[PDB]
Amino acid sequence: MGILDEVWKHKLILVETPDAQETSLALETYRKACSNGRGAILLSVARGKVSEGIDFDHQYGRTVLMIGIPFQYTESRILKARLEFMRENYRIRENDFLSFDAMRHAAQCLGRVLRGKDDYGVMVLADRRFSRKRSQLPKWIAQGLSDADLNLSTDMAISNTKQFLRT
């Protein structure tokens, strides 16, 4: 809990049974954390509720983290029925169900970082299966986890110096 006592302090974790008041209180306190020089950790579900979309400020998370790639609940009768239904229609068996669905659940995370050309943001993606799919503005460089810690320290200082240079 060192990040929950010396970095982000308070914790904003979205549960599986996310209440509408609980999602409202975790959203306002996340805006109260960044407006006091604190910062908070928004532990949400990419498959859960509240897809958001409001940003365009420094109150939002400037660095957005994703745990791997979004997946879908397999071994269900609803999925096996829609698998054979679209197999006769478009013959996209075992392809779009694991990739086109996994992209749109990841593209909801991509819609929050791009908050205009005036605000910056860094979106990191794990694993290696993301290279087989496409993304909005496909300019992606692959590096390690400890390597990007020194890259993001440069990206949090170059963007503070190149903001008044391009104007």
Binding site: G37, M156, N160
Partner: protein, 335 residues
């Protein structure tokens, strides 16, 4: 005229080894040179050092025009270790309590050297930012690498609605550049207010050291400045006398005003094939060609810095030397 309040970060975030050997060993070291850069160009201004250690604000240097009080205050910080967390609210409220003796005629400045990324404030910090605009306090924060959303509102709302004061440092060479601009004043557009100051006596240079004389210490002295109002032989300084609240400056204020009135006219660098003049310098003797990149397409071209105030040819070396000290171009004094 100026009453700067230095706000230094002295916490566990300064224990990192970003600089050489660390952040705290270069912030304290470069601030001693900033004291030397401040009292030379502004010998009749004030300074105040407030550290942010252990979630509080500790006053280690009182507001005074003596430069040696701020040197020995910074020599005690390097002995201990910076611990705790920065407190921006306790540092600004302590800076508010010292700038209230500072009048409206003297400019109130607050410089914050913030190398951390997270602070610990008691109450609401937004109630402290709006208080600095109500009494007109110019706050400037120097943030390290990443930007803080608090310092963007602090360097804009306290600075006439303009965010350009929250600077981001990336090198130790760039940190000394921030101490050169902060040593210079900020002649802004202001808010068009009235200004009138009087009661400025002159110090008589006395050298009596037989049984000595001291009105501000009652000790032995090798000569002190005599006040022209209360007739007291106190300490020799260009500040105010401590017996009747009257000044005692001389040519130190005149040298600061001459630098303030120095507009520094840069000489127009015209080529030797364009200005139709030989390679010569109005300050010395620059009889060498400037440009010499190509064969004869640049060596014969050259450059002669023609100052437009007297049409005198010069070079690039003395054009920055005349704008730094003395008068801008020596050909201006001759008609």
């Amino acid at each position: 005229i100026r009453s700067l309040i230095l706000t230094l970060d002295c916490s566990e975030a300064m224990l990192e080894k970003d600089l050489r050997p660390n952040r705290h060993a270069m912030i304290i070291q470069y601030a001693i040179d900033f004291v030397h850069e401040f009292f030379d160009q502004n010998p009749i201004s004030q300074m105040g050092i407030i550290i942010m250690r252990n979630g509080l604000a500790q006053l280690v240097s009182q507001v005074s025009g003596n430069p040696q009080d701020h040197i020995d205050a910074l020599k005690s910080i390097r002995k201990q270790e910076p611990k705790g967390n920065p407190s921006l609210q306790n540092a600004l409220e302590m800076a508010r309590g010292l700038l209230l003796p500072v009048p409206a005629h003297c400019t109130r400045e607050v410089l914050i050297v913030f190398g951390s990324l997270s602070t610990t404030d008691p109450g609401d910090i937004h109630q402290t930012i709006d208080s600095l605009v109500s009494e007109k306090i110019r706050v400037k924060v120097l943030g390290l690498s990443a930007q803080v959303a608090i310092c963007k509102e602090l360097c804009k709302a306290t600075n006439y609605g303009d965010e350009s004061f929250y600077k981001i440092l990336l090198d130790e060479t760039h940190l000394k550049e921030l101490f050169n601009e902060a040593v210079t004043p900020x002649x802004x557009x202001x808010x068009x207010x009235x200004x009138x100051x009087x009661x400025x006596x002159x110090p008589t240079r006395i050298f009596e050291d037989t049984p000595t004389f001291c009105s501000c210490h009652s000790k032995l002295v090798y000569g002190g400045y005599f006040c022209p109002n209360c007739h007291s032989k106190v300490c020799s300084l260009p500040t105010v006398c401590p017996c009747c609240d009257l000044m005692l400056i001389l040519x130190x204020x005149x040298x600061x005003x001459x630098x303030x009135x120095x507009x520094x006219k840069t000489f127009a660098e015209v080529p030797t094939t364009e200005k139709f003049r030989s390679e010569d310098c109005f300050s010395c003797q620059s009889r060498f060609p400037x440009x010499x990149x190509x064969x004869x397409x640049x060596x014969x071209x050259x450059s002669r810095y023609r100052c437009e105030d007297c049409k005198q040819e010069f070079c690039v070396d003395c054009d920055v030397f005349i704008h730094e000290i003395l008068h801008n171009c020596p050909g201006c004094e001759s008609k």
